[PDB]
């Protein structure tokens, strides 16, 4: 009965207890005591430098095959798990993000050892494409911020349409004078505006559209989650349709679901020949984990339908597949769920969709 | 003012000799990188750093960029993993490395092919970084430019699958010239496998970037004889000469720092525990001893000391070309 360690960097000491519970339940279910999993974990440290050292001294030193990481927004890391994506990425040790949804972690050139139990904000275009198929929309307007986040949401939507259905507009972020682009949009002759921006950049687009009278009547606003949360929600058109990722902020659910995937990937890993143990510590070890690249390929190729957050499969770049969203619609200053994205189709809810300013429709047929 | 210098045992360093702090560091692991820099910053108010390792680890560059973004210390990658091409550097970092971009090396490679009219070729890459960029620039240049070419499509593969899963993809190449892009570690497996298929013979031409050649002082046994490559490690460009070429980038940037502000930003207190201006502005356009030592927002060198090399039958690299004069290359007329 050999020992196989699973690393984790969580936010609270209480979440560590759930992590050890998830590993314990992983050993009760199908482990057969053929391989015993251990739960090595530390609470997230504010200091980035101090966090990167705690990976080496507490996690890497315990010969961890993979590291889980949740990143709520208390301190100093740019709100992105960079100091652990690099440290474990030095040895090709798979890092599994639980909460972070930044589209920059999809590129396996910057984070070649990173996975996600949550989809990036760019994969919300999978709902936009299905919603265009639902209402047979063939001419939409795509307004995206000019960053790697908005460029990702644009490329994902176009690749879903490729395999001339949209004219795209861009704008320099941080600007508070985007009337030149909406005037560009108001003459583009299309009623479906798809916006992809930050919470503050959405407020700029919303109130700038309030001037040119594009906030109601013959217009359809379809957005994601950052555009209907926080300040953007307060200035959001009445009748706007945004998305809310189901179980996107449930750290406890993502913990028990990630452990379930790792355990299944760990056991099918040890059905292969020539396996080497993960590096014991950082100091004195300058080469990658020879089994690392193979184990990451196993993790991404894994399929776990009985997940607590739905079917758990991973993308070519390690992003999560089959993630289910909630289709909200702002009605009288209140976000109303008019349906959910099942994962393969759009489930039509009992409530009714209120368009901007006095007409109605539904997610039926 | 104070400048640290961390180098390895490569290219025969012994005594390096404003104030300079030198040390021989053969620990290129994440903690030691964080430790020895923070241990310098605290107890030796270094205002800049010239780093160099003896490994081929691409990740060291990614760690120095992370350390520089947290310590606000200008770091210069001079040799080894710290000069290896990496994803674009952090915009908030002061980490720069002596190395040609992916694009510059690509142009050089194509320039060699144009010289010998190698119009028909193939492309073989792995998912390793630069895989997105390398084909685009190459695909863009050939398609847009007017000349005769046969890309023969792009062959990509994963160097972690079962062996002979790599082979089936490999037997699909129909070109004398083959452009191979991956890490040095991956390249070993690829070329080892291709050798058995007879694709490493002299009737074929494998061209690899500086990612694959890596240190021009460590040649694996699997690298086939006659391997054409571009690399910035010039073994006559002395390591000892590099730091003096790197010190000039910092001192001339710090001197300028008294202009448009007359104070040098003191080093941070400590990396541990609970930046008015950046020298970043002053290092992208440095001139020193007729050498345009200049960098870009991306972080790679503007005038990169890139050299065309081939693997000799004697198992030693040898220079058979030059670049970095200005635009254009200077082959030696032998193939």
């Amino acid at each position: 009965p050999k020992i196989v360690n699973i690393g984790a960097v969580l936010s609270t000491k209480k979440h560590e207890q759930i992590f050890r519970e998830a590993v314990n339940q992983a050993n009760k279910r199908h482990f057969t005591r053929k391989i015993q999993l251990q739960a090595t974990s530390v609470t997230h440290r504010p200091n980035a430098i101090q966090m990167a050292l705690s990976v080496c001294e507490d996690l890497i030193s315990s010969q961890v095959y993979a590291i889980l990481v949740s990143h709520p927004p208390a301190p100093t890391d740019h709100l992105t798990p960079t100091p652990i994506s690099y440290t474990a990425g030095f040895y090709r040790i798979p890092v599994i993000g639980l909460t972070t949804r930044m589209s920059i972690y999809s590129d396996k050139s910057i984070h070649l050892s990173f996975l996600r139990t949550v989809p990036p904000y760019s994969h919300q275009a999978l709902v936009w494409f299905e919603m265009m198929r639902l209402f047979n929309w063939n001419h939409v307007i795509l307004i995206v911020s000019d960053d790697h986040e908005g460029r990702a949401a644009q490329k994902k939507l176009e690749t879903l349409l490729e395999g001339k259905a949209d004219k795209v507009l861009q704008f320099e972020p941080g600007t508070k004078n985007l009337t030149a682009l909406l005037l560009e949009a108001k003459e583009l002759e299309a009623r479906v505006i798809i916006l992809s921006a930050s919470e503050d950049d959405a407020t700029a687009v919303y109130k700038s559209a309030a001037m040119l009278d594009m906030t109601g009547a013959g217009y359809v606003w379809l957005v994601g989650e950052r555009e209907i949360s926080g300040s953007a929600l307060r200035y959001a058109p009445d009748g706007i349709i945004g998305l809310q990722l189901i179980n996107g902020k449930n750290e406890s659910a993502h913990i028990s679901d990630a452990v379930a995937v790792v355990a299944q990937a760990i056991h099918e890993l040890f059905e292969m020949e020539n396996i080497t143990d993960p590096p014991r510590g950082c100091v004195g070890n300058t080469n990658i984990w020879k089994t690392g690249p193979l184990f990451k390929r196993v993790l991404m190729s894994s399929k776990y339908p009985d997940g607590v957050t739905g079917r758990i499969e991973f993308n070519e770049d390690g992003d999560r597949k089959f993630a289910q969203y909630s289709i909200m619609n702002l009605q009288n200053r209140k976000l109303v769920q008019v349906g959910i994205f099942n994962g393969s189709y759009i489930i039509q809810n009992d409530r009714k969709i209120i368009w901007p300013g006095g007409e109605t429709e539904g997610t039926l047929v | 003012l104070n400048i640290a210098v961390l180098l390895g045992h490569s290219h025969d360093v012994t005594e390096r000799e404003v104030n300079v702090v030198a040390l021989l560091m053969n620990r290129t692991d994440p903690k030691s990188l964080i430790t020895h820099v923070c241990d310098l910053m605290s107890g030796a108010r270094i205002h800049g750093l010239v780093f160099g390792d003896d490994t081929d680890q691409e990740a060291v560059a990614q760690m120095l960029d992370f350390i520089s973004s947290q310590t606000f210390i200008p770091i210069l990658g001079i040799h080894g993993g710290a000069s290896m091409i990496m994803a674009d550097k952090d915009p908030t970092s002061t980490f720069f490395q002596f190395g040609a971009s992916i694009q510059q090396q690509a142009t050089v490679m194509l320039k060699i092919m144009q010289d010998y009219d190698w119009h028909v070729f193939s492309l073989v890459t792995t998912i390793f970084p630069g895989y997105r960029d390398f084909i685009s620039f190459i695909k863009t240049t050939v398609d847009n430019s007017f000349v005769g070419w046969d890309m023969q499509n792009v062959i990509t593969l994963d160097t972690s699958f079962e062996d002979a899963k790599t082979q089936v993809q490999l037997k699909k190449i129909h070109s004398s010239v083959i452009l191979l892009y991956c890490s040095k570690d991956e390249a070993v497996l690829i070329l080892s496998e291709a050798r058995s298929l007879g694709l490493t013979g002299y009737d074929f031409f494998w061209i690899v970037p500086s990612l694959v050649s890596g240190n021009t002082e460590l040649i694996p046994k699997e690298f086939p004889s006659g391997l054409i490559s571009v690399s910035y490690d010039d073994w006559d460009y002395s390591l000892e000469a590099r730091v003096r070429d790197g010190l000039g980038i910092l001192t001339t940037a710090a001197s300028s720092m008294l202009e448009k502000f007359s104070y040098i930003p003191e080093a941070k207190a400590s990396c541990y525990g609970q930046p008015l201006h950046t020298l970043h502005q002053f290092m992208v356009n440095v001139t020193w001893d007729g050498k345009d030592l200049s960098f870009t927002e991306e972080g790679y060198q503007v005038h990169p000391r890139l050299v065309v090399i081939v693997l000799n039958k004697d198992r030693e690299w040898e220079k058979v070309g030059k670049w970095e004069n200005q635009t254009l290359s200077l082959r030696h007329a032998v193939w």
Partner: antibody
Amino acid sequence: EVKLVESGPELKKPGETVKISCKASGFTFTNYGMNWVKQAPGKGLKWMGWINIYTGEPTYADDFKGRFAFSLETSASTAYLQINNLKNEDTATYFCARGYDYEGYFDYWGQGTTLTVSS
Amino acid sequence: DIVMTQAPATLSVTPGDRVSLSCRASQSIADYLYWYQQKSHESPRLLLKYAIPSRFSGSGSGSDFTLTINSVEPEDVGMYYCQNGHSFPRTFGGGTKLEIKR
């Protein structure tokens, strides 16, 4: 290569003041907490208190309040222990233990400083 | 305060047998129960965290915990404490001295 070295044994008459040191070497000091345990000769293990390092926040036990202090010098990587108004019942061996994760278990102990409060 | 009671506080296991010690908490400490080992004249050493140091096994939860030596080596003679890490004040068990037959 993690080691915790304490100051040697000390003898101080009842009523005096003593300070003991725990020298940390091998780990990131601010990444852990320091725990102080006292062992009377054969009596057992009594936990005295825990001190966070990122935040110099002492957390003493109710029985060790008033005349027990947890000093801290992170620049020299050392946690101290000051005891005022020495009573004869303080004749014990005092350990310093690194707290894994700042509140967790004690994965590394010092060699043990032996105090003898006699006259 | 939580009272960590460990009984029996004495054992005399034959070499190669399987030792099973017992640590019962006054209340419920969940899994925050660490085990320690004290050599004759040395500081106590952390054996198990959260329930050669490969012969030691740690089962138990809530208020009933057991540490188990599968194949007792003669170099395992010493004391064995259990620590409530759940709630302040941190309390230790009564301890159990493990002598062996010969």
